[PDB]
């Protein structure tokens, strides 16, 4: 999550729904209307880097973020059913980082517990896949397609470590 | 938006980082994203002009306390995001260049920018200078692999011809094997002339 | 002059410094350059190091010990030293 | 960068092998390096030279494992098999692991690497057949892997204890376990007010 | 019965370069494992370098004598030992330079900060300090000519904390790192106040993780995974060595 971290930059660039708590003339560029003043109660998705700051500051905060479908209770129920079967990458490549940022902006113990359980199950599956080494598979391909980009990087690191260890063991 | 170009540049940086992590051997780095960088710089100049206009509006005094403050804050945040993206991409490319200099220059100019090429030359000069002086006894450019094998059979991957040794000249005639200490043949292996006996 | 005596010295001073191949004929040419001074020319050792550095800066070519280019580089470095004097 | 990306988090198996080589090992010399009162010398700056210079034929002596293997490359050196590296000791460790699924058998942290290196080189020195020792090592590795799977099922963010686990196993598990525990700790910290 | 072990011990009682090499190995391992840069041991490094120089000179003299008993096996042993020692020293120095470049901004901040307990020269070697200064200056010149000329002067500062993510980068104290409890540096377990009896007669060292405010005891001669910040106290005490 570094300042120069490209993945963190992309996750911050991701937009989230929000509802305006203020009416600001001259902010029509965010509205995408050249001369229309911003209005209170207006609903507009905003980039996470800007939406989070607007939710933090404003006293009444300047904007209030609406709950995303990635944070929807239906997605939560699907995760509680089967953490592995869900396509977290299709939902968001930075879904875990976005969940962590949403927990930081709004402390949610149950959400953190559900996210941790999903991460643990997906990590067990990813560890099984990484332990499976060549002496592309459809099952691993579908699992990676479900797996987010960060989880795929972790899986690549673990699988490369296992493959290097096996190669060094089987070769002089 | 203005930050979208920086996001695209950072996406290219992440793609190149994943590629370099995938390939152990150093590939010729992707050509510098001069187009996206120049677009981001033009956006930064436009935002600077907008900030100057906002300061002029503040001198006019209309809503300078709140509306102009928010507009200037938004423009400054956009400039900061663009600068962060550009710095991240440049740092990743420069780290790749430093790794390449440690790999080869210690023992694809079109892809690099001219400033990047000057920086890589300066890094190679710095490596040679660090080896040239204190701690010169150990070749800092020498391989980081532990000396697992004192002696190893060596033969030419290529017919380079005569080659120097500590006290000998060895012909590298094609497919000519040898039995020598690994340390002396480490430089020749780095040259690629001899591979695995 | 004393190419065998300078051979380990030239090998170290060049190959350890830059990774550059030193041909035996080039070592012999450097020996003749050293023998151009009647006595041992220890300062000429640093002069040869400077010549190798200038050759790496200009030609930037491996196998500089072939001495076809190294003799001209030696003349160039000698002229540079004369200008320095 | 100066450090390879894979090396940023964990030591390589070759590095673990280098550490195991830094460990010492007993061997039987075949050269009377010791000179009678009636010669080249090691003069090692990082290790004892007196043992090497006092070695005599068939006089058991201990030296750093790398130097021991270097001498074993010559016919002069024959490495002494570790006592725990015996069929009876391996069977005892296997029975201990079977009786204690929670508790790992008290094998050395470099037991796996040392057994592999000895099978590569010191297979001749083993009085017991090398195949039986290899099978026992594989059985112990499988038991330890099952125990590691159970422990991963029982992970905790606060801490973990692995007493008798092999150093190679710890090095292999460092990336995955460290990343998972760090992610869990980050989730718990974000949950914390 | 009467115990005369003390009497027998009293009757029995009537700088090692190898130990320095072992200390260098432990220090290099701790430097590789620890995100924070370790303080530079100048005396030990200089003694090892002098020993390496003398060994190389002796090997060269032996080579001259051979070119003029005659057994090159000890010479090969000395050459391999010198190669291994030089490789270890170079690896430690390269890791130190990597840490210096990773925290160049924080190191400039620490050098500027008189309140910082450790002087930059104290933490680094002289060559390390010169390298950090020159590298930071070159990077600052490049970044300034690249972007700072167009950037407004209020935001032109490279190391400023005004950004939401501070541009200065510092080692992660709280990062988890594996460790094996070395036990007390002294032979006597009771002599170490940190060492204390735990259940089943096991000496242990009490430790606390500030984030959870949890207190735990680390048995001597045992391996554990803990945050580097809490581990740093025992590491400075040398009671535990990073894996």
Swiss-Prot record, chain A:
It is found in: Nucleus. Coiled coil: none annotated. GO terms for biological process: DNA-templated DNA replication; double-strand break repair via break-induced replication; mitotic DNA replication initiation. Pfam families: PSF3_N, Sld5. Disulfide bonds: none annotated. SUPFAM superfamilies: GINS helical bundle-like, PriA/YqbF domain. It comes from the Eukaryota. Its main location: nucleus. Keywords: DNA replication, Nucleus. Transmembrane segments: none annotated. One of its GO terms (cellular component) is DNA replication preinitiation complex. Gene3D superfamilies: 1.20.58.2050. The keyword Cytoplasm does not apply. InterPro entries: GINS_A (IPR021151), GINS_bundle-like_dom_sf (IPR036224), GINS_Psf3 (IPR010492), GINS_Psf3_sf (IPR038437), PSF3_N (IPR055221). Belongs to the GINS3/PSF3 family. PANTHER family: DNA REPLICATION COMPLEX GINS PROTEIN PSF3. Present with 2205 molecules/cell in log phase SD medium. Functions as part of the GINS complex which plays an essential role in the initiation of DNA replication by binding to DNA replication origins and facilitating the assembly of the DNA replication machinery. Component of the GINS complex which is a heterotetramer of SLD5, PSF1, PSF2 and PSF3. This is DNA replication complex GINS protein PSF3. It comes from Saccharomyces cerevisiae (strain ATCC 204508 / S288c) (Baker's yeast).
Curated annotation (Swiss-Prot), chain C:
Disulfide bonds: none annotated. It comes from the Eukaryota. It is found in: Cytoplasm; Nucleus. Present with 3110 +/- 251 molecules/cell in log phase SD medium. As accessory component of the DNA polymerase epsilon complex participates in chromosomal DNA replication. It is required during synthesis of the leading and lagging DNA strands at the replication fork and binds at/or near replication origins and moves along DNA with the replication fork. It has 3'-5' proofreading exonuclease activity that correct errors arising during DNA replication. It is also involved in DNA synthesis during DNA repair. DNA polymerase epsilon is a heterotetramer consisting of POL2, DPB2, DPB3 and DPB4. Belongs to the DNA polymerase epsilon subunit B family. This is DNA polymerase epsilon subunit B. The chain holds residues 12 to 96 of 689 of the full protein.
UniProtKB/Swiss-Prot annotation, chain D:
Functions as part of the GINS complex which plays an essential role in the initiation of DNA replication by binding to DNA replication origins and facilitating the assembly of the DNA replication machinery. Component of the GINS complex which is a heterotetramer of SLD5, PSF1, PSF2 and PSF3. Interacts with PSF1 and SLD5. This is DNA replication complex GINS protein PSF2. InterPro entries: GINS_A (IPR021151), GINS_bundle-like_dom_sf (IPR036224), GINS_Psf2 (IPR007257), PSF2_N (IPR056784). The gene is PSF2. GO terms for biological process: DNA-templated DNA replication; double-strand break repair via break-induced replication. Belongs to the GINS2/PSF2 family. The keyword tRNA-binding does not apply. Keywords: DNA replication, Nucleus. Transmembrane segments: none annotated. It comes from Saccharomyces cerevisiae (strain ATCC 204508 / S288c) (Baker's yeast). It is found in: Nucleus. One of its GO terms (cellular component) is GINS complex. Disulfide bonds: none annotated.
From Swiss-Prot, chain E:
Belongs to the GINS4/SLD5 family. It is found in: Nucleus. Its main location: nucleus. This is DNA replication complex GINS protein SLD5. The lineage of its organism: Eukaryota, Fungi, Dikarya, Ascomycota, Saccharomycotina. PANTHER family: DNA REPLICATION COMPLEX GINS PROTEIN SLD5, SLD5 PROTEIN. One of its GO terms (cellular component) is GINS complex. Component of the GINS complex which is a heterotetramer composed of SLD5, PSF1, PSF2 and PSF3. Interacts with PSF2. It holds the Pfam family Sld5. Keywords: DNA replication, Nucleus. It comes from Saccharomyces cerevisiae (strain ATCC 204508 / S288c) (Baker's yeast). InterPro entries: GINS_A, GINS_bundle-like_dom_sf, GINS_Sld5, SLD5_C, Sld5_GINS_A. Changing residue 28 to R: In sld5-12; temperature-sensitive mutant. Defective in DNA replication. One of its GO terms (biological process) is DNA-templated DNA replication. The gene is SLD5. Required for DNA replication. Functions as part of the GINS complex which plays an essential role in the initiation of DNA replication by binding to DNA replication origins and facilitating the assembly of the DNA replication machinery.
């Amino acid at each position: 999550m570094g300042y120069y971290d490209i993945d963190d930059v992309l996750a911050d660039g991701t937009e989230f729904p929000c509802k305006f708590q203020y009416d600001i003339p001259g902010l029509g560029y965010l509205e995408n209307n050249p001369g229309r003043p911003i209005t209170k109660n207006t609903k507009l998705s905003l980039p996470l880097w800007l939406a989070r700051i607007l939710a933090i500051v404003g006293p009444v905060p300047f904007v209030e973020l609406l709950p995303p479908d990635m944070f929807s209770t239906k997605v939560m129920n699907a995760i509680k059913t089967d953490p592995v079967a869900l396509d977290l990458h299709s939902i968001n490549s930075h879904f875990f980082s976005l969940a962590i940022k949403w927990i930081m902006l709004f402390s949610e113990k149950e959400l953190a517990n559900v996210v941790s359980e999903l991460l643990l199950q997906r990590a067990q599956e990813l560890n099984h896949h990484a332990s499976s080494l060549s002496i592309t598979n459809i099952a691993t391909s579908t699992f990676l397609l479900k797996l987010e980009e960060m989880e795929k990087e972790i899986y690549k690191k673990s699988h490369e470590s296992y493959k290097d260890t096996k190669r060094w063991m089987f070769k002089k | 938006m203005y930050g979208d170009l920086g996001n695209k540049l950072v996406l290219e940086a992440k793609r190149t980082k994943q590629l370099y992590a995938r390939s152990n051997q150093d590939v010729n780095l992707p050509m510098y994203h001069e187009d996206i960088i120049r677009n981001i710089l033009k956006e930064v100049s436009n935002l600077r002009k907008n900030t100057e206009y906002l300061k002029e509006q503040q001198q006019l005094g209309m809503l300078d306390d709140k509306v102009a403050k928010c507009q200037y804050f938004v423009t400054l945040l956009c400039m900061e995001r663009n600068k962060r993206c550009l710095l991240a991409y440049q740092r990743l490319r420069t780290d790749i260049l430093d790794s390449m200099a440690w790999n080869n220059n210690g023992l694809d100019t079109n892809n690099l920018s001219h400033q990047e090429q000057e920086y890589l030359k300066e890094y190679c000069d710095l490596i040679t200078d660090l080896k040239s002086g204190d701690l010169v006894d150990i070749d800092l450019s020498g391989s980081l692999v532990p000396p697992s094998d004192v002696f190893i059979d060596v033969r030419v991957l290529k017919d380079a011809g005569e080659i120097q040794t500590e006290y000998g000249v060895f012909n590298l005639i094609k497919d000519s094997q040898f039995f020598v200490r690994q340390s002396d043949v480490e430089r020749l292996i780095q040259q690629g002339y001899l591979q695995k006996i | 002059i004393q190419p065998p005596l300078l051979r380990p010295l030239a090998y170290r001073v060049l190959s350890r410094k830059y990774g550059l191949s030193i041909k035996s004929d080039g070592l012999s040419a450097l020996a003749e350059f050293v023998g151009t001074n009647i006595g041992a020319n220890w300062r000429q050792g640093p002069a040869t190091i400077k010549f190798l550095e200038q050759f790496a800066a200009v030609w930037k070519q491996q196998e500089r010990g072939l001495f076809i280019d190294q003799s001209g580089v030696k003349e160039v470095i000698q002229e540079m030293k004369e200008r320095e004097k | 960068m100066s450090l390879p990306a894979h090396l940023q988090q964990t030591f390589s198996p070759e590095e673990i092998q280098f550490i195991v080589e830094n460990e010492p090992i007993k061997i039987f010399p075949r050269i009377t390096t010791r000179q009678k009162i009636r010669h080249t010398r090691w003069q090692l700056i990082t290790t004892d030279d007196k043992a090497l210079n006092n070695m005599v034929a068939m006089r058991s002596t201990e030296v750093v494992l790398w130097i021991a293997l270097l001498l074993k490359q010559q016919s002069k050196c024959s490495i002494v098999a570790p006592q725990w590296l015996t069929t009876k000791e391996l069977d005892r460790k296997i029975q201990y692991e079977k009786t204690h699924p929670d508790r790992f058998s008290e094998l050395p942290w470099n037991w796996l690497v040392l057994a592999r290196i000895l099978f590569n080189k010191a297979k001749d020195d083993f009085h017991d057949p090398i195949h039986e020792l290899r099978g026992k090592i594989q059985d112990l590795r499988e038991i330890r892997q099952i125990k590691v799977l159970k422990g991963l099922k029982y992970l905790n963010e606060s801490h973990l204890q692995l007493d008798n686990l092999s150093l190679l196993e710890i090095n292999e598990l460092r990336p995955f376990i460290t990343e998972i525990m760090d992610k869990l700790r980050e989730i718990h910290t974000a949950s914390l007010t | 019965d009467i115990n005369i072990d003390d009497i027998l011990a009293e009757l029995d009682k009537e700088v090692s370069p190898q130990q320095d090499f072992s200390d260098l190995m432990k220090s290099w391992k701790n430097e590789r494992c620890s995100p924070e840069l370790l303080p530079y041991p100048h005396q030990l490094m200089k003694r090892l370098l002098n020993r390496i120089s003398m060994q190389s000179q002796l090997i060269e003299n032996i080579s001259m004598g051979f070119l003029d008993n005659e057994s090159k096996l000890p010479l090969l042993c000395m050459e391999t030992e010198l190669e291994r020692l030089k490789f270890v020293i170079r690896s430690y120095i390269r890791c130190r330079l990597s840490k210096i470049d990773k925290f160049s901004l924080y190191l400039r901040q620490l050098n500027e900060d008189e309140n910082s307990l450790i002087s930059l020269t104290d933490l680094l070697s002289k060559d390390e300090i010169k390298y950090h200064d020159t590298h930071s200056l070159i990077w600052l010149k490049l970044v300034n000519d690249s972007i700072l000329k167009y950037m407004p002067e209020e935001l032109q500062a490279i190391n400023d904390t005004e950004g939401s993510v501070n541009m200065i980068d510092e080692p992660d104290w709280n990062k988890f790192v594996f460790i094996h409890v070395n036990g007390p540096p002294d032979g006597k377990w009771n002599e170490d106040p940190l060492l204390q009896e735990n259940e089943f007669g096991k000496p242990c060292y009490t430790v606390t993780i500030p984030d959870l405010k949890e207190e735990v005891e680390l048995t001597i001669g045992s391996i554990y995974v803990m945050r580097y910040e809490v581990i740093r106290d025992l590491l400075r005490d040398d009671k535990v060595a990073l894996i």
